[PDB]
Amino acid sequence: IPFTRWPEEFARRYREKGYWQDLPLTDILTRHAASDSIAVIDGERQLSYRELNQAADNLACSLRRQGIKPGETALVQLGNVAELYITFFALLKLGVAPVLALFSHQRSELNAYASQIEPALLIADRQHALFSGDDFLNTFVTEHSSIRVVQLLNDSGEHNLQDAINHPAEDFTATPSPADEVAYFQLSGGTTGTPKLIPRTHNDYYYSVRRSVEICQFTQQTRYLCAIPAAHGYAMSSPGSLGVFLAGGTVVLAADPSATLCFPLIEKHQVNVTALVPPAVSLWLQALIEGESRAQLASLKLLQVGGARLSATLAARIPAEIGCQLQQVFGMAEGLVNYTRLDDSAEKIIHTQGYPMCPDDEVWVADAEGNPLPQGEVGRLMTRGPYTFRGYYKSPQHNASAFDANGFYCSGDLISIDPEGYITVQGREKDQINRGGEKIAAEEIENLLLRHPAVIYAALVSMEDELMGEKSCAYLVVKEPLRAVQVRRFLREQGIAEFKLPDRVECVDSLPLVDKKQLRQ
Numbered sequence: 001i002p003f004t005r006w007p008e009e010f011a012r013r014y015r016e017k018g019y020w021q022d023l024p025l026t027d028i029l030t031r032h033a034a035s036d037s038i039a040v041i042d043g044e045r046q047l048s049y050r051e052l053n054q055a056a057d058n059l060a061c062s063l064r065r066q067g068i069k070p071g072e073t074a075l076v077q078l079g080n081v082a083e084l085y086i087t088f089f090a091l092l093k094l095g096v097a098p099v100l101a102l103f104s105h106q107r108s109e110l111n112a113y114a115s116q117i118e119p120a121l122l123i124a125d126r127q128h129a130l131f132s133g134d135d136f137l138n139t140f141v142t143e144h145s146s147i148r149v150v151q152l153l154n155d156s157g158e159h160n161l162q163d164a165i166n167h168p169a170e171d172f173t174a175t176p177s178p179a180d181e182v183a184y185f186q187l188s189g190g191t192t193g194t195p196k197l198i199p200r201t202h203n204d205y206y207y208s209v210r211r212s213v214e215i216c217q218f219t220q221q222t223r224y225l226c227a228i229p230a231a232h233g234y235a236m237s238s239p240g241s242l243g244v245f246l247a248g249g250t251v252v253l254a255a256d257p258s259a260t261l262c263f264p265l266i267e268k269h270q271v272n273v274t275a276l277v278p279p280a281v282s283l284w285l286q287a288l289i290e291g292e293s294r295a296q297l298a299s300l301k302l303l304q305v306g307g308a309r310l311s312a313t314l315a316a317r318i319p320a321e322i323g324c325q326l327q328q329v330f331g332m333a334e335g336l337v338n339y340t341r342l343d344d345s346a347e348k349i350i351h352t353q354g355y356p357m358c359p360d361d362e363v364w365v366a367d368a369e370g371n372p373l374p375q376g377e378v379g380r381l382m383t384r385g386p387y388t389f390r391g392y393y394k395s396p397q398h399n400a401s402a403f404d405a406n407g408f409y410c411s412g413d414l415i416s417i418d419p420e421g422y423i424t425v426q427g428r429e430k431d432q433i434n435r436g437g438e439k440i441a442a443e444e445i446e447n448l449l450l451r452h453p454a455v456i457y458a459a460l461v462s463m464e465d466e467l468m469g470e471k472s473c474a475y476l477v478v479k480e481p482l483r484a485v486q487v488r489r490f491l492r493e494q495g496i497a498e499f500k501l502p503d504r505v506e507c508v509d510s511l512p513l514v515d516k517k518q519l520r521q
């Protein structure tokens with residue numbers, strides 16, 4: 001599986017400092033293989049570590065019997081269900097590298113992922129609108145003929161994922177890829193018209209999980225609510241569910257971040273940490289204002305907020321109105337995660353996005369032509385380190401743009417750094433809408449819009465929104481009358497996730513040639 005390696009002097013240093021341990025990610029689970037403490041709670045279901053590891057082995061073995069092999073790829077689409085984790089570990093034990101699509105993703109996104117990775121295996125959920133029947137499956141499996149095996153959650157037919165999980169593995173031995181090779185693919189936010197995949201090696205991903213565990217002080221006492229989409233990296237690894245498993249704690253799954261679902265799960269299971277994006281935080285606080293008892297949240301000790309910038313106003317209200325500590329998390333799937341620390345001053349927790357997890361994360365701020373700027377100045381985030389990738393999968397053209405000559409990645413973010421060394425996020429250069437933490441590549445949607453018979457020119461831009469931070473607005477130059485609902489129905493036909501439909505559509509008599517900077521004025 002081809003990916004961009006670190007230069008040999010970097011690998012060598014990162015091993016010498018102990019960052020790269022050359023253990024597979026399977027070891028996060030197998031170190032607890034003999035434990036009957038609870039690893040996952042999913043509704044009424046409670047899975048121990050012993051059971052979780054046995055389930056992954058059963059699934060792996062079963063897939064192996066069906067002919068799936070090490071070095072192959074898989075496409076997986078599961079939401080906040082225990083079978084996400086079983087599946088992730090089963091594929092790791094086989095040496096098969098998955099993309100974990102979010103439940104919300106639709107035809108265009110799944111098609112794009114499958115086209116790039118040519119998966120031998122598809123795992124999905126009949127609860128998803130695409131997979132309740134067999135029509136789409138038929139089309140999908142025809143247009144991506146690399147697929148040999150299909151397993152489905154909530155199926156009772158011959159493709160029942162549960163039959164595999166429940167089938168005791170006879171004589172199974174795990175064959176994870178080497179630790180310095182690819183374990184799985186993460187998804188980028190998106191800055192371009194086609195999705196970009198981020199190869200993650202065992203060494204590099206395990207380090208980001210293990211170091212996050214130290215910073216967040218997770219142990220067997222950790223009871224972690226995973227309520228945002230579980231397969232996103234913030235939920236998975238910062239420290240996320242994998243950090244919880246590493247530390248032997250418990251992950252409580254919720255279908256979404258609503259107060260209605262989560263206030264009860266927090267009280268019931270005595271959750272002590274969770275992870276939110278800013279709007280979820282406002283909604284929780286407003287739920288408390290509307291009368292939910294604050295006592296349902298007593299057990300909560302740490303709340304992480306990330307994905308988009310938390311305002312200081314909103315941040316301050318957390319210890320006050322909820323009574324736990326805040327941790328700001330400013331991370332990206334490409335690598336680099338900055339944390340405020342548990343012993344930081346209130347000033348740093350409230351006003352900054354923290355600093356890098358690793359002492360050898362190298363972060364500098366560039367001006368427009370690639371030159372360093374002194375501290376305090378606002379500029380482009382440039383970075384490299386032991387868990388930051390060196391290239392998107394099979395994307396030479398785009399890789400040429402995304403990295404400088406020395407291997408620094410440019411995250412498309414504008415930042416400034418404190419005298420004390422802390423990062424504040426000040427704006428953005430990449431052509432991307434951050435809608436309450438979820439990422440929308442404007443060019444992707446603009447390309448889809450131009451496919452409309454009536455649309456001559458298309459621009460997608462973010463607009464301030466109090467709750468969501470940013471909402472999306474499509475500016476169109478049209479041949480003919482065109483209402484928002486027509487655009488939205490059309491896009492939905494193309495098959496994209498709901499969160500990517502424009503919140504707002506305006507037909508305009510003209511647009512500048514599209515010069516978005518000028519449009520903002």
Ligand SMILES: N#Cc1cccc(C(=O)NS(=O)(=O)OC[C@H]2O[C@@H](n3cnc4c(N)ncnc43)[C@H](O)[C@@H]2O)c1
Nearest residue numbers: 189233234238306307308309329330331332333411425
């Ligand atoms: N592995 C991982 C991980 C951990 C926490 C958050 C994220 C994340 O949001 N990743 S992303 O791949 O969906 O996109 C990252 C982009 O989110 C933005 N971001 C993210 N956290 C902030 C922030 N705290 N303030 C302001 N902008 C932010 C920033 O633009 C960054 O480049 C990923």
